[PDB]
């Protein structure tokens, strides 16, 4: 999928989370959200369309989602071993790390 739909993924399945019930609930929802946000990993933002695709920029940008699939993996995990809770916090605190790219190529 391109770009903006991955975000769109991301952020309705955000909402998923924030009033999921049970941990299969949040599992689902950050299963979905890890891939969307790989695959925008592999696309190019409209701001550095015309930068190299080795430029620091592009990098920085595909860094980013490493990063957020990194703690995606950790709220996974609590989800996995039962802490609806935890993974929940976990999952809507993933926005400081959305705003922050956001900031700088959105
Ligand atoms: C950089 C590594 C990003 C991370 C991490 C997140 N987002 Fe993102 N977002 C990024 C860019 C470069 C853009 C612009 C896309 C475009 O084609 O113009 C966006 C955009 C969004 C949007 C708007 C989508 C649209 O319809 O235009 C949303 C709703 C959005 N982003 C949400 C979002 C969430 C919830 C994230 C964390 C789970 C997240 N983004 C991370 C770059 C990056
Ligand atoms: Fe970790």
Known sequence: ADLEDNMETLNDNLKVIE?????????????????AALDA??????????????????????????????????????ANEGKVKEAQAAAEQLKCECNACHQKYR
């Open 41 to 78: 990993q592999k696309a190019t933002p409209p701001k550095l369309e015309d930068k190299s695709p080795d430029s620091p920029e592009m990098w920085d940008f595909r860094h980013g989602f490493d990063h957020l699939v990194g703690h995606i993996d950790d709220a996974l995990k609590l």
């Open 19 to 35: 009033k999921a019930d049970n941990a299969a609930q949040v599992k689902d929802a950050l299963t979905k959200m890890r891939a």
